[PDB]
Structure formats: structure tokens, C-alpha cells
Design a protein around this ligand. Structure first.
Ligand SMILES: CCCCCCCCOc1ccc[n+](CC(P(=O)(O)O)P(=O)(O)O)c1
Ligand SMILES: CCCCCCCCOc1ccc[n+](CC(P(=O)(O)O)P(=O)(O)O)c1
Ligand SMILES: [Mg+2]
Ligand SMILES: [Mg+2]
Ligand SMILES: [Mg+2]
Ligand SMILES: [Mg+2]
Ligand SMILES: [Mg+2]
Ligand SMILES: [Mg+2]
Lengths: 358, 359
């Protein structure tokens, strides 16, 4: 059922935005059609975990007239599309930054035959413009509007800061200087767990975990009823683990199941696998990694992969996952004490995360 | 005087932004330094025409206490001025990438800096926009005008992004515009019309360059409704169109040494004022020569397009266009003057920075 109201609201949103462009922005039906295709290609096709979480948190909190339920759940649906549109935006631009080929078993937006890279960049930011435009339209008379926008913008900013951490992680930050060219790091001295945890906290955790929970609480008018200290701890922990999962799958999960080809090795990313391998590797193994990392050459890539399985990384992953589950279980119970319906929805979100195959 | 106060506020904004990153966002000193340099390079060094207009509008409406209002209003105007300046910074970073440009204000484009990767350039460009919101939320947190300011600022930003879509798809036959299918640059240029030019330009330039600074100056001085907005918008659209026509003409005919940027319109096959004006008046023979030479990087092909423009007396058309604009502007400024004398004067001042600019 939630998927049904969600997809009805997508149409509501799509119609408001495309008709506004027709009527107030002088747009021709040729471009309206292009934008319609763009929206559908970029915003649909996923599992909508972020947006569906907003709905579930809302449905979990309606208690702590059936008109209110209808209004609150519609508000949640709009909020859910705001995060789905935001991630739509993030992924269009990220695929460009990461030189990716496919996404959900289709070409990346910028990789479509009639999308130029310069138009893809612009399309990507229109997606983010729509997130604000939809909020202002659907929530114009809602008192939570200001708080919602403020929190949403902070999270977006947080994510762009994390993207900076990601995209500059393979350059020696002491040598960071607009005026001087610098090659990829050769010593990898910054590929540390502490540095990994920072990239992933900022670029993933806030928008993937905190934001949906927070938006769910806002449309419920229930925010100040939860322990926000514990909520953020939980969001940071699940968010980190989610990105470790993403990083592991990038290397080890068949692209046909993932829907996308991995680029982290080629792009010389500070992944979970890279940091954890380098922390434990022999000098000999580090030498071979350095000789093979961050190149498109397919044997070099397979070398890195071999090194990873040689150093029992999957063993380290299982142990990390159990340590995470342990901490997540504890925090949910701390949450259960004063917010049992909210704690229930966090458990459901955790259930969508723990040991996902995707 | 305005530049003095304006630059003090720049320091104030920079400090807030970069300290917040260090204190709240776990940012290391190396990246705080990169971001400071990125901010200075992208935001400083221009004419600050947009930002200085906000201050001027506000210092003009400071007619309609102990001196406290004035200090507050002028500071707010300075912050809004930097909001547009940062927004313009954001547009130029991303536009130079999109336009395959090489220099900007006589230095390399941001994405052309030796130690800036294109992927970082894209993100750096976006941080600049994020900063416009963050500076507004901090400095204006207790102002009643906050929501209105943010609503209008955002509407203008979105307008500008729509204009950029118009600009970037102008060389493609829109009937064949299709994500799934590759298409070359147009060969008939049937959409290179003045009607299509006027829309590209209204959206990508006039709203953020002309309307927005005027509106923000009115907001911080709390004078927004005191003004005929139909006339004001008319003015901004006319002035903004002219400015872009000027930008387009300079792209072709002003030495990069005075421009501070190397022109890319011919090479990028842009629906420029020159191209649409030429195509409307040109003989069949001239048109066929243009078609053979437009949208190519080859230095011989671009020189042909310059020659065809000279041959067709486009400098003659421009002078008459400019004269026609100047007349309508003066008429509209007088309509404003009746009930809005202070604001009309600031609009006259903005016109003065625009008309026959040597930029
Ligand atoms: C102009 C746009 C500015 C950039 C905005 C921030 C982009 C944040 O993009 C993100 C954040 C988290 C995950 N992802 C996608 C992930 P993937 O789906 O594996 O490509 P990854 O980190 O591994 O690349 C993209
Ligand atoms: C990721 C955000 C990118 C899209 C945001 C909209 C960009 C609009 O940029 C604009 C709008 C108007 C003039 N300019 C610069 C002009 P120039 O300074 O001559 O390069 P032109 O139109 O000829 O390129 C840039
Ligand atoms: Mg990616
Ligand atoms: Mg990435
Ligand atoms: Mg990945
Ligand atoms: Mg451009
Ligand atoms: Mg340009
Ligand atoms: Mg130009």
C-alpha cells in the first residue's frame, strides 16, 4: 500500500513541476518532454528506501480525525520524494565525478546518447531545485515549513562537504593547492580508518539515515519527543555500515545484481577495503597494491581484488558487521524506552540495511 | 565607501563559513585553506555590479531613530550583496565547465587551475551556492524578511538554471531532443531566432543580474511593495537582455586582454545575438557560408564567422538596438520616478553601469 500512495504523489509532484515550467517559465513541450524523461530516469528505478522510511516513520508516530492521517501521510510522501529527488541529484553528479558507466542496469544519465555532459550537470541541479520547489508548493501553509527547509539544507550541505572529502581523498592534503598540479598519492598515508569514517559520515550517513528519520518526525509533529542524541548515534552507525556495504559490493558483487559497474579501484577511492587492507598488510602487500591501485587496466584491478581476498578482508567485514549490529541493537533499546513507535521504525530501517544483497 | 564596508563583510562571511567547517564539520586545516583560496578566486576580482546594487538600492531607500536602522540595513544589504556575488561565483564555475572556457578575469577558469580536478571544480561550484543559503540563515536568522528573501532568491536561481537549459540546448533541433538518441549540432539553424534568443537571455541573465539585486535591496530596506513591480520587472528584463547582447557582442569583438576571458560562442555554436541577427538579415549565400563555418574550433572557420558579421553590418544593428533600448529604459525610469523617486535613482545608477559599458 505505501508504494501505491507514494507513486500517486510522484505524479502529483511531476504534474505541478512540469506544468509550472510550461505556464510560468515559457517552456516548449519538446523540453517539457525531455525534463519528464530525465525526472523518470533519474528518480525512479531504485527501492526508494530513503523515501519509504519517511512514510514508515510517519505511520509509526500517528498517536504519540482520519483527515489528519491523510494529511500527515501525504506530507510524508512529499518529504520522501524530496529525499529521492535529492539522491537523484547526488547520483547524476556523482556518476560524472566518478566516471561511472551504468546505474541500475541503465547507462548513467550523463552517458545517455542525447544527454551532453554539460546538460547532465544542469539536469542534475534541476533535480535539487525541484526538491525546494515541491516543498514550497505542498507545504506553503504548514508551520513546520521553515524548520524542514533549514534541516534539509544543512544535510545537503553536509553531504556536499563529504563529497569533497571523497573526491580529494587520494591526493596528499598537505600538497592541496589550486595553483600546482599533484598526482594521486603514492604513500597513501591518509588512507586511514579515521579518514574513511569522516568521508562516509558526511557523504552518506546524514542524508541516507538521519534525514529520513528527521523528516518522518517533522510531518508527525513529533520531533522533540525523541532522544535526538541517540537518534543521531544510530543514524551515524547505520550510515557508516551502509557505506562499508556499498564499498564492499563495489569490488565483490556481480554488476548484474548490483546494476552498476564498480569504479572505486580505478578511481583510487579511500574505500573501506583499501583502508582496512593497508592497516594490516605486509610491506610486500602494500608495495604490490601501490603498484596496481588507481588504474583502469583490468589485470591491475584484478590484482587489487586478489590482494583483498588474500588478506582476509571478508573476515574483517563479518566481524565489523557483528560489532555494528551489537551497537545498533543497544541504541534501539535505549530509544524504545521513551519512543517505542519511533524505535520500531528505526528497527525496520535497520532491517532494510543489515545483510542487504541489493 | 560602499566597497570598504562590502569587503569588511566579505571577511565576516568568510570567517563564519570557514570556522563553521572546522568546528562543526570536522574539516582539516589543509581543506580549510583550499576552500578559502577557492572562495577568493571565484568570488573576488570582478566589478561586484550585482552586489553593489543591493547596497545602493538600500542606501537610496534610506530616506523614507539614532542611526541604528541605517547600520543594520546597510549590513544586511552587504550580506545580500555577497549572496548574489557568491551565486554568480557558483554560476561562473559551472558555466565555464559547460562552455569549455579557458580563462576568466584574465586567470584560468577554476576548473582549469593546475591542482583543481574537474570533479572537484563541480563540487566547489556547488559549495559556493550552498554558502549563499548558509550565510542568509546565520546573518538573517532573526529577520522577519528571511522566508520571503529565501523564497525569491530560490525562485530566481531556478529561473537561471532553466535559462541555462535553454542556452545549452539551443544548438540542438528541439524536435529531436531525446535522451536515448544522439543528435548533432543543428544544420538548418531554424531555432536560431530572436524570439528564442530573447527567452534564453531573459531566464539565464536578466532575472539574477538585474531583477534580483533590485529586489534584495528593497527587501533589506523593507520597501518591496513601495514600488511598481510591473515597471520594475519590465526594466530588469530590458536591461538584462541588453547586458547579454553586450556580453555576446564582446565575446566576438573585444580583445580577451580587456575582456579577461576568451570567447567561446562561435566554437560552442551558441545562439548568440550576433548569430540570430545575422541569420535573420543574411542572403542565402552568406547563410550557407555561416553554416559551413559555425560551431567549429578551427581558427580559420571562426575568423570567417567574424568576417561575415562585419560584412552584414551587425555593428550598425547593435547601435540602433542600443538606442532603442536606452529610450525605453528612460521612459520606464520616469514611470518609476513618480511614486518611487529614491528607487528610480538607484535604477538610473544601475543603468549607468550598464549602458555602453566597455567591460
Ligand atoms: C554539483 C553536485 C555537488 C555534489 C553533491 C554531493 C554528492 C554526494 O554523492 C554521493 C554521496 C554518497 C554516495 N554516492 C554514490 C555512491 P555509488 O552509488 O556507489 O556511486 P559512491 O559514494 O560510492 O560514489 C554519491
Ligand atoms: C550546477 C549549476 C550550473 C547551472 C546554473 C546556471 C548557470 C547560469 O550561468 C550563466 C548565466 C548567464 C551568463 N553566464 C556567463 C556568460 P560568460 O561570462 O560570457 O561566460 P555566458 O552566458 O555567455 O556563458 C553564465
Ligand atoms: Mg559514485
Ligand atoms: Mg562517488
Ligand atoms: Mg560506491
Ligand atoms: Mg554559458
Ligand atoms: Mg560562459
Ligand atoms: Mg558570454
Amino acid at each position: 500500500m505505501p508504494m501505491q500512495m507514494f507513486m500517486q504523489v510522484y505524479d502529483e509532484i511531476q504534474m505541478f513541476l512540469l506544468e509550472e515550467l510550461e505556464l510560468k517559465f515559457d517552456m516548449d513541450p519538446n523540453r517539457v518532454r525531455y525534463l519528464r524523461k530525465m525526472m523518470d530516469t533519474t528518480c525512479l528505478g531504485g527501492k526508494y528506501n530513503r523515501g519509504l522510511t519517511v512514510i514508515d516513520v510517519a505511520e509509526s508516530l500517528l498517536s504519540l480525525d482520519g483527515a489528519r492521517r491523510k494529511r500527515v501521510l501525504h506530507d510524508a510522501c512529499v518529504c520522501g520524494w524530496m529525499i529521492e529527488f535529492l539522491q537523484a541529484h547526488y547520483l547524476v553528479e556523482d556518476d560524472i565525478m566518478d566516471n561511472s558507466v551504468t546505474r541500475r542496469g541503465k547507462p548513467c544519465w550523463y552517458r545517455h546518447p542525447d544527454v551532453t555532459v554539460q546538460c547532465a550537470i544542469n539536469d542534475g541541479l534541476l533535480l535539487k531545485s525541484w526538491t525546494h520547489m515541491m516543498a514550497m508548493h505542498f507545504f506553503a501553509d504548514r508551520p513546520f515549513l521553515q524548520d524542514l527547509l533549514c534541516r534539509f539544507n544543512r544535510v545537503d550541505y553536509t553531504t556536499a562537504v563529504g563529497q569533497l572529502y571523497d573526491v580529494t581523498s587520494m591526493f596528499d592534503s598537505n600538497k592541496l593547492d589550486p595553483d600546482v598540479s599533484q598526482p594521486t598519492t603514492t604513500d597513501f598515508a591518509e588512507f586511514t580508518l579515521s579518514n574513511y569514517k569522516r568521508i562516509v559520515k558526511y557523504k552518506t550517513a546524514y542524508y541516507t539515515y538521519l534525514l529520513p528519520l528527521v523528516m518522518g518526525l517533522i510531518v508527525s509533529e513529533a520531533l522533540p519527543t525523541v532522544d535526538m542524541g541517540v537518534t543521531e548515534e544510530l543514524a551515524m552507525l547505520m550510515g557508516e555500515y551502509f557505506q562499508v556495504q556499498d564499498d564492499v559490493m563495489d569490488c565483490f558483487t556481480p554488476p548484474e545484481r548490483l546494476g552498476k559497474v564498480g569504479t572505486d579501484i580505478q578511481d583510487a577511492k579511500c574505500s573501506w577495503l583499501a583502508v582496512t587492507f593497508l592497516a594490516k598488510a605486509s610491506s610486500a602487500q602494500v608495495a604490490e597494491f601501490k603498484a596496481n591501485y588507481g588504474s583502469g587496466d583490468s589485470e591491475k584491478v584484478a590484482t587489487v581484488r586478489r590482494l583483498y581476498e588474500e588478506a582476509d578482508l571478508q573476515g574483517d567485514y563479518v566481524a565489523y558487521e557483528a560489532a555494528v549490529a551489537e551497537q545498533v541493537k543497544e541504541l534501539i533499546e535505549k530509544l524504545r524506552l521513551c519512543s517505542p513507535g519511533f524505535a520500531a521504525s528505526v528497527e525496520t530501517l535497520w532491517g532494510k540495511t543489515y545483510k542487504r544483497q541489493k
